[PDB]
A paper describes a structure:
Here we report protein crystal structures of a piscine betanodavirus, the Grouper nervous necrosis virus (GNNV), in four different forms. The overall topological structure of the GNNV CP consists of the N-terminal arm (N-arm) (residues 34−51), the shell domain (S-domain) (residues 52−213), the linker region (residues 214−220) and the protrusion domain (P-domain) (residues 221−338). The S-domain comprises an eight-stranded anti-parallel β-sandwich with three short α-helices, which is a canonical structural feature similar to other virus CPs. The P-domain folds into an independent structure, including eight anti-parallel β-strands and a short α-helix connected with loops of various lengths.
In the delta-P-domain mutant, sixty copies of the S-domain assemble with interactions of I2, I3 and I5 symmetries into a T = 1 SVP with a diameter ~190 Å. Only residues 52−214 of each subunit are observed at a resolution of 3.1 Å. As expected, the delta-P-domain mutant comprises a canonical eight-stranded anti-parallel β-sandwich with three short α-helices similar to the S-domain of T = 3 GNNV-LP. Although the organization of the equivalent subunits around the I3 axes of the T = 1 delta-P-domain mutant is notably similar to the arrangement of the iASU subunits of the T = 3 GNNV-LP, the organization of the trimeric subunits is flatter than that of the T = 3 GNNV-LP. In the T = 1 delta-P-domain mutant, there is no Ca2+ observed at corresponding calcium-binding sites as seen in the S-domain of T = 3 GNNV-LP. The hollow or empty binding site exhibits an expanded geometry with maximum movement of ~2.6 Å of the main chains. We find that, without the Ca2+-mediated interactions at the subunit interfaces, the weaker contacts cause changes in the inter-subunit organization, with expanded assembly of the T = 1 delta-P-domain mutant, similar to the structure in the Asp mutants of T = 1 SeMV. However, the bent conformation of the subunit dimer leads to the disordered N-arm lying at the inner cavity of the T = 1 delta-P-domain mutant without β-annulus formation. The T = 1 delta-P-domain mutant without Ca2+ incorporated shows that the region containing the residues that potentially coordinate Ca2+ exhibits an expanded geometry, decreasing subunit contacts along the two-, three- and five-fold axes, and a flatter dimeric contact of curvature ~155°, compared with T = 3 GNNV-LP.
Numbering used by the authors:
A (entry chain O), B (entry chain N), C (entry chain H), D (entry chain M), E (entry chain I), F (entry chain G), ...: 52 to 214
């Protein structure tokens, strides 16, 4: 077939949350998923022109001591468009997970599952499959170095070359 | 299957055309079809993120005496975008019906049949499957209290909670 | 195959018979059927050279109050050339219908079925499948605003680009 | 089927390159592909809302004499949005061909194959499948009268009338 | 069977186009296809009375030096009737070809495919299957001796003898 | 079958040829075959719009003494439009017969087999299948009262009423 | 197949034999069978180059009163070459018929059955299949207007064009 | 089988057409085909008595610069006996090709397929299968050195020895 | 099998025929095909004792402007021995090609097909399977740089070490 399947896993973001600064609803990560954000896919984005997302998961990897009065809710909402960053809105999505900050966790969302576009558009419903949000629950006793990782499997289409 | 199917019939609009105000080409109704317009699906759209239209039929239901020398043409054009509210243009669509103001009628269009978006978009041929237009033909002798109803059936897709 | 199939319904004419101006044998419509009379086929006849008539009906759709003392005969004579415009003459064609002015009605004729030509010619039995006539019967008590509609289904032949 | 299949071949543009005006990367033709450009599709686009491309080709037909020091690269890139008009951006596409100016040549691109819309819109990745670019390689000895032909096959879908 | 199949290939016309006299749109050949024009068929035309065209092709055979800044478009429009001799109108037909004057080329049109008449009629839609047009593109540097050839396959019917 | 099959045998003409007034080539009969010529069919022609011939035969019936130096040729040529009235022209038809004036003889032509119209038209190859010609051979020694009879089997197709 | 089958029936000759001028052995017709002599075949003779005779018959059609003391012998000898025009030599051939001058008659000969040539040769055994002779038997009382007719079926070969 | 098959390809002729001497209808080659003319068949002809052509093609091989405004029409007429050396006559034969003088070309005719004789006789349609003709179309600007080659496949039949 | 198969394509010769020196007969190449002329095979011959030629072809590859009045004949005689270097003699062999000097061409002969010998012979009918000849036809107008290439495939025989 003409379609090219790429897979990888990349750090979407890394936030450092100081000793006492989290509270119910504080947005610690808000990452809109674009090929530029996943470095290996960022390169293959310049070779093809449309990409379609075949599997997406986000691994929340917070790094703090086991004595942290932590808490987060992590979710992937499928519109890059909207800013509805509240707990209930995250928990309404499929992947949604909640955990104490000393607990790793994986969000397995359900998404567009459709053909997209490797470069910006007038209508951005076809340039990004969604965005990953990470919210505080309660308030952290200790310093947290959260890094979220996106594992991705993508099928790429129409050859091209954007310089 | 994940896709949730949902059906109903809703009053899209209700106009009161006064007692002589018609003439050929007068727009009494011009409703752009979106989840908020159909109050049951209104709520199903706050839950889910996308939706595809499985059936659409519009039931023109004017209410006036049998002694009304009226005339309407009713038609569903599938560009939620296109201002083109003229007899010929409406009659070119599929479901298009024409009738005296004391005759009920149903339009059965053909349409997008595609997958849309419960939330408003920057590009709006992904938000609405089109619009329903009721046009005067000749002039009414009498008052008409027109109510268009939409019978609909719809498959809603990715879970969410878009306030 | 090569052939294109188009289908639509279109207003062929509109007349506004006022107060008391019809009368046993008065001609309110006399429409020689060509692609130009059907807006959609007007455009698709510029593109193709020839066309064959696969279905043809006419839907008389007059508009008056139910207290109107009218009546019409309507029929399709299958000679674009035939000038005979009397009651018996119409009542000898197949679908021929007669009805009070407050009834809609459908004439379903039988016709050429042959392959014609989208463009004017020296012999016009190759340009038109016939002509739709609408006569008055009795003498209307009131103001009729009548529109006749042609429901067509046609197949187009050999490419071209007529100005 | 409710889908019509149409097929033609239309001149996309005509450029006349005078006796020494071309040069590595000089842009001679750059044409965003839309129904209006291809005469017969323009007339049928005025009749259906939607269209989808089944076959796309571009025949480059330069007219000049055999003693010309020519050269060209023809490519079709499939965003009507993209400006990258450099040799290596064209060669990166599937159809890309190069030739001396006294050599006709067909480009066989790979393209959208998706369902578009026959009128302009806010996002034009839905109105057009791409653009044909024609660039000079080297400078011409002589006068070139280049005409690019686009052969096409299209399937049109939802009835309408854009007067 | 009673039907008689004849085939051949004949010179429809021969134009001599002097050193500098062609320009965009100049009609160099305009030949209405009649049995008299194909000499072998011209004879068999006097034996039968109706002829029907089973295969038609035109071979454009321009004769000039390879250093000619030439260009032509050749097309077969299926009405002997109309004088629409513009490039776009020719290219709209099926056979349509364009080429530099030092390139042979074959137009393979689509035509009436119907029964015709071996002698003149009041309505000439049935005496000739169309006409072959040859137009200049750009302007010729040199003298061109174009000869167009029609290859034909015809089935002849009803015996007869016209003296 | 909606179609009506109708058959008769009627007198096309009657010519009385005095004692010496025939001569190689003299046209005694030249009849163009149309409904009205055939009595029964002339009435059935008023009821329907088209007819297609299904069998035709012309029975030549000269009455005169056995001592007559006569001679005729009779044939059916299939245009109503051909004035070729010469022996060789007649003989080259299929039906063609030659006989002495005291022999009954039957022309069995091959002919149109196509669908005509029951009404005169602008092109007359859609109204009559041909014409029966009768010419003298030698000269007649005696009075000859020739009568020709068309035998016909015809289908009639499209209901109507010509008054 | 490449072979073309033609059939017809033509007047080979017409002799007028005055009141008393025939006698045993008088040659009234002596016709060498060439394509030029059969008018329809005369035309097709210029299109092909070799013709082969598939069926031959001659219908003797003498026209005189029933009171004629007539008599003829008619025969087809298969060499165009030889002048042996005696009764016995005619009766030796296969078709040979004898009859009173007031009797029609048909000679059904046997012939070369071989490939021939549509135009003259140094050896004429291949340009004509034979010749038809008509001789007087006894002597005619009255004037006879004999016309002999050749019915022929021929298959034609190798395309060509003789002007 | 007592038949010896022989193949070859030989030069029938070579002509040098100087600077400006060609013109429509100028005969530059008129070669009647006999075994003496094909060198190897010449020798095999002396050994046998009868030969029959099984394949027969002519390769026209003109040599001149690409900058030549020439033109030729070549064909093979199948009688050695016919002098018709006009264009129309050549184009009517099967092989007949036309071409500018800087284009090579092959005539695949249709021909005798009969059994001929290796030696001269009174009738010469038994000794040659026909003759190759080459005609000018337009005037050559330049010097052409034209060689026509004949590829042949012949079957030789009755042994002898003609010293 | 014990056999070792070896293939290549080698430049047998490079001549350079100056701008007016060529004429019908002039020998430009005359290369006798020995293992040493084919360099790759040159080395394989020192390893084995004998070799049998399995596929042989010669590609004539003259370079010159397209405005050259040239002409050649190329052919492979399968006689290393024979000094017959004349047009007819070359045309008698199988591959033999003729062509203008600005046309590439491929001779494909039929040859010895036998087992020869990689070291010189006292009978040289077992060391080289023939020789490739190139002649002039007419005279060249421009300098010609001809290079002939021998495409070869070979099977080599019996192990050895011949200095």
């Amino acid at each position: 077939t003409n379609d090219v399947h790429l897979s990888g896993m990349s750090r979407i973001s890394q936030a450092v949350l100081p000793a006492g600064t989290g509270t119910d609803g504080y947005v610690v990560v808000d990452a809109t998923i674009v090929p530029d954000l996943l470095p290996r896919l960022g390169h293959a984005a310049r070779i093809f022109q449309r990409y379609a997302v075949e599997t997406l998961e986000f691994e929340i990897q917070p790094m703090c001591p086991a004595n942290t009065g932590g808490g987060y809710v992590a979710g992937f909402l499928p519109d890059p468009t909207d800013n509805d960053h509240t707990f209930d809105a995250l928990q309404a999505t499929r992947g949604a997970v909640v955990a104490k900050w000393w607990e790793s966790r994986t969000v397995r969302p359900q998404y567009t599952r459709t053909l997209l576009w490797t470069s910006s558009g007038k209508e951005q419903r076809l340039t990004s499959p969604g965005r990953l949000i990470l919210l505080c629950v309660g308030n952290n006793t200790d310093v947290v170095n959260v890094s979220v990782l996106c594992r991705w499997s993508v099928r790429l289409s129409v050859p091209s070359l954007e310089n």
